[PDB]
From TrEMBL, chain B:
Transmembrane segments: none annotated. The chain holds residues 333 to 996 of 1328 of the full protein. Residues 46-201, 429-607 form the FANCI solenoid domain. Disulfide bonds join C375-C402. Residues 211-410 form the FANCI helical domain. This is Fanconi anemia, complementation group I. It comes from Homo sapiens.
Length: 338, 607
DNA sequence: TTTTTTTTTTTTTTTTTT
């Protein structure tokens, strides 16, 4: 009886009552152009959109109706996309469905996997990935920034990683700045943000600043995230900066802050370092230079000998060299029996 | 001690006089492969030295000369002894997995400049043998996934193909590759986006599933949307998508519409959908220029080829609704206007002389290649439409006359300077299936319902020499790389079946119709069709001895041991050489004699 | 005028000597 359901019935989608998927009479492009010309040639042009989206939000007040509206339709003629993605394919409908998609997302913060184990807010942000046309790009960016602030920790971890799918190829600068400003405060979200920051299109002198920023606060990271962050730091070396970052990493990593709770994480971390020096030879020479040049500081850690044994046991051109360096650590008193 | 053994064995095998004297000695190869069998029990002391010998043999004797007998055959045989040592040692010693498998991978990943085909062969063998025994030593694989961005593209395609039997059985390893490919989809290097495209096309090609089976469909749709976005990048990533979409259809039929609209919208950027507008493709939009650097984007030829192949598979398979007729009539309008276009609609030969000095000649040369590719695709289309209609064969002739006009344009422009460019010998867009079917229909076919329509094609001698030229090009591509360029040109069984069919047709044209029917001209005496058929026969027999060595029996059955079949074929060829000789010709075509003794030298290695 | 073959040069690999 609402204007929305009547226009959708004459467009050619059967609206299901909220168990199974919505049916399709015509193709996707046919339905989209049909509803486009239907809203075009209809009189009272600047108000039928607002009447349409008010009928839409009144329809998606229900849990099952909205949950099926997020899920993908059924082909009668053998399986296609969702009504929300098809409805957001039309540019004149886009920003209203964007707004009434984000207004009802704080409704599903504490709601998690009730009946069909279909988590709702990841399904809400699933409909924004790979939009063909984006109208309001700055407005969409500010809306997801408000969302990425107010969210739960798991939900903000989830939406933060779907950022490069969601955004186009313009607006990456202010997103990079706001993400780094979220990174300097929150240290629980160190692991996905760096993941995304290489995956956007940032300028390299932003990335080197964020790399220095995350190496500075390397002691304040929980045990589960440490091999992933060191994996990023080792994966993000060039040929030119490699000895400076390797020396910083040698001076900052301790294993006297993280020692089936810490031994497994230390195992994983040494797997990461072993595999890093195996598939990349210059990290071994960089790390031996970073230990050999530590001559004045008789604060030699455990990490110095465990890394000398690991570069010994792996790539075997270094053996004589790590035989030599270790001799000059024993005569000089810098490595001792304790 | 291994290289000496193989030199000795090659020397005896090449000569009977030494076979009579020397009684058959065990060689160091058989002794080493006995050591690996013996070591199963308790000899763990031995097996860490077996692994080091394996990788010393492979590291020291692997190829380099392609990036001869003595530098090749006792070094090929040592490097394949290495892989046999490591593959037999891998199977039984359950503790030097992860010492072979992280060292194979460490040579594949990190070297990537020196040829590493032997390690990809070994890794394919190791995986394919038992991914059931590799799910206990699997993390050594998924740590080389993180290095996949920085590799060259052919190594990424080859490494993903090799590791594919692990991706069939293991779901955790597939969902570990998807995170790498999705992360590298956006990376700032060029090769990372190509490797992401390759990996996603191979995951769509080989797999259905990527828990309720509604989300697998929306995951396929989301991957396909990312690939639809990658369709607006540079020319080569577009070209990779165009080769891949056909095989994406042909495995997962359900993605039919989601591929085809993806091409049709992409077709409509470069199509003008009004009649009586004579350049019926916008060739300007295909070339971009930014400060005198001038380059292609969206090759129309490969796009049309992918459209036409997918459309043929849509007709023949899916139907035995109102969408494919639209693309049919679009293609028919392209044919109908490409017939009555001529050369100033794309401003060719008159305004620009295709000069490799200026940007405008570059633009017109690119334009000329695009029109040549379009005409080849529409030749294949017009053949494919009907059951030998006369009108469509007239359109085939008109399209070929356009293509031949552009070829005679381009050949004269390679006449002032040299033919240093390998871009006119660049690949045809006819599948090997089509060239096989076209030559079967041209020469052998004598069904009266098709004669009146084929007789317009037979009367065109230049068309028939173009056809056998294209067949010779497909056999040359099969020899030089492993496989040919078109559709179904990466499956060895399909190239085998098309090799048998070309062999049959070229044999029938060579033996039945002699050489002495030359009533054309004295410039055509090194370019005759009965000469080219013998040349294609020579290439086919060489290529089938090299690549399809285990099938030569079932290669000859399509034309009792291999000796009687080869003897009958030698009787045909040596009768041909005899009548060529005893004719006592004073002009004496020695080219046909050289090809006959070359094909007899090829054949006589089977007796 | 172009394609193929032959001849020369250079580079790489292996052996032998200090």
């Amino acid at each position: 009886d609402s204007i929305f359901v009547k226009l959708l019935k004459i467009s050619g989608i059967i609206l299901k009552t909220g168990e199974s998927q919505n049916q399709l009479a015509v193709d996707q492009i046919a339905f989209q152009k049909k509803l486009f010309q239907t809203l075009r040639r209809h009189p009272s042009y600047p108000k039928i959109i607002e009447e349409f989206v008010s009928g839409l939000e009144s329809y998606i007040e229900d849990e099952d109706s909205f949950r099926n509206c997020l899920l993908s339709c059924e082909r009668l003629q053998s399986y296609s996309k969702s009504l929300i993605k098809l409805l957001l394919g039309i540019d004149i409908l886009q920003p209203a469905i964007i707004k009434t998609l984000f207004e009802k997302l704080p409704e599903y913060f504490f709601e998690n996997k009730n009946s069909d184990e279909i988590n709702i807010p990841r399904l809400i942000v699933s409909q924004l990935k790979w939009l063909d046309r984006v109208v309001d790009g700055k407005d969409l960016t500010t809306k997801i920034m408000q969302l990425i602030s107010i969210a739960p920790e798991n939900l903000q971890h989830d939406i933060i990683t779907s950022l490069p799918e969601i955004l186009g190829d313009s607006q990456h600068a202010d997103v990079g700045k706001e993400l780094s400003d979220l990174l300097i405060e929150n240290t629980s979200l160190t692991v996905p943000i760096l993941d995304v920051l290489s995956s956007l299109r940032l300028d390299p002198n932003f990335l080197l600043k964020v790399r220095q920023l995350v190496m500075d606060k390397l002691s304040s990271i929980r045990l589960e995230d440490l091999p992933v962050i060191i994996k990023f730091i080792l994966h993000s070396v060039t040929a030119m900066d490699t000895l400076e970052v390797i020396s910083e990493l040698r001076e900052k990593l301790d294993l006297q802050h993280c020692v089936s709770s810490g031994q497994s994480c230390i195992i994983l971390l040494f797997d990461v370092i072993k595999s890093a020096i195996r598939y990349e030879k210059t990290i071994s020479e960089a790390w031996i230079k970073a230990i050999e040049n530590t001559a004045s500081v008789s604060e030699h850690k455990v990490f110095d000998l465990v890394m000398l044994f690991i570069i010994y046991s792996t790539n075997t051109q270094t053996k004589k060299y790590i035989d030599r360096v270790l001799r000059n650590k024993i005569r000089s008193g810098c490595i001792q029996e304790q | 001690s291994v290289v000496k053994s193989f030199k000795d064995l090659q020397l005896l095998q090449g000569s009977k006089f030494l076979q009579n004297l020397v009684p058959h000695r065990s060689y160091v190869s058989t002794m080493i492969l006995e050591v690996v069998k013996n070591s199963v029990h308790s000899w763990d002391h031995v097996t860490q030295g077996l692994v080091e010998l394996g990788f010393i043999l492979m590291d020291s004797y692997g190829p380099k000369k392609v990036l001869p007998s003595l530098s090749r055959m006792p070094n090929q045989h040592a490097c394949k002894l290495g892989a046999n040592i490591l593959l037999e040692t891998f199977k039984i010693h359950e503790m030097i997995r992860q010492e072979i498998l992280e060292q194979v991978l460490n040579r594949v990943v990190t070297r990537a400049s020196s040829p590493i085909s032997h390690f990809l062969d070994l890794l394919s063998n190791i995986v394919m043998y038992a991914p059931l025994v590799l799910q206990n030593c699997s993390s050594k694989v998924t740590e080389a996934f993180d290095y996949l961005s920085f590799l060259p593209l052919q190594t990424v395609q080859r490494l993903l193909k090799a590791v594919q039997p692990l991706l069939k059985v293991s779901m955790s390893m597939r969902d570990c590759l998807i995170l790498v490919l999705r992360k590298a989809m956006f990376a700032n290097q060029l090769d990372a986006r190509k490797s992401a495209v390759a990996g996603f096309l191979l995951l769509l090609k080989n797999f259905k599933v990527l828990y309720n089976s509604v989300a697998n469909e929306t995951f396929c749709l989301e991957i396909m949307d990312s690939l639809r976005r990658c369709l607006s990048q540079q020319a080569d990533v577009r070209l990779m998508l165009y080769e891949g979409f056909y095989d994406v259809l042909r495995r997962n039929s359900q993605l039919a519409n989601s591929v085809m609209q993806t091409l049709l919208s992409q077709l409509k950027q470069f199509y003008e959908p009004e009649p009586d507008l004579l350049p019926p493709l916008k060739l300007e939009a295909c070339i971009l220029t930014q400060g005198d650097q001038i380059s292609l984007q969206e090759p129309l030829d490969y796009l049309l080829c992918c459209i036409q192949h997918c459309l043929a598979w849509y007709k023949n398979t899916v139907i035995p609704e109102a969408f494919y007729e639209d693309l049919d009539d679009i293609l028919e309008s392209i044919t109908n206007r490409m017939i009555k276009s001529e050369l100033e609609d794309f401003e060719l030969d008159k305004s620009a002389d295709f000069s490799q000095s200026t940007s405008i000649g570059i633009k017109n040369n690119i334009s000329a290649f695009l029109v040549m590719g379009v005409c080849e695709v529409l030749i294949e289309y017009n053949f494919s439409i009907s059951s030998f209609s006369k009108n469509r064969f007239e359109d085939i002739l008109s399209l070929f006359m356009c293509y031949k006009k552009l070829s005679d344009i381009l050949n004269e422009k390679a006449g002032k300077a040299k033919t240093k460019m390998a871009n006119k010998t660049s690949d045809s867009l006819l599948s090997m299936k089509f060239v096989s079917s076209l030559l079967t229909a041209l020469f052998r076919d004598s069904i009266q319902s098709h004669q009146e329509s084929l007789s317009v094609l037979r009367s065109s001698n230049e068309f028939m020499r173009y056809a056998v030229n294209v067949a010779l090009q497909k056999v040359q591509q099969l020899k030089e790389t492993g496989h040919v360029s078109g559709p179904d040109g990466q499956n060895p069984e399909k190239i085998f079946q098309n090799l048998c069919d070309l062999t049959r047709v070229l044999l029938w044209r060579y033996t039945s119709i002699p050489t002495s029917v030359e009533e054309s001209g004295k410039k055509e005496k090194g370019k005759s069709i009965s000469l080219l058929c013998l040349e294609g026969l020579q290439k086919i027999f060489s290529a089938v001895q090299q690549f399809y060595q285990p099938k030569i029996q079932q290669f000859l059955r399509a034309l009792v041991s291999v000796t009687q079949r080869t003897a009958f074929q030698i009787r045909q060829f040596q009768r041909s050489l005899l009548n060529l000789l005893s004719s006592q010709e004073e002009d004496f075509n020695s080219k046909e004699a050289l090809l006959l003794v070359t094909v007899l030298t090829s054949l006589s290695k089977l007796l």
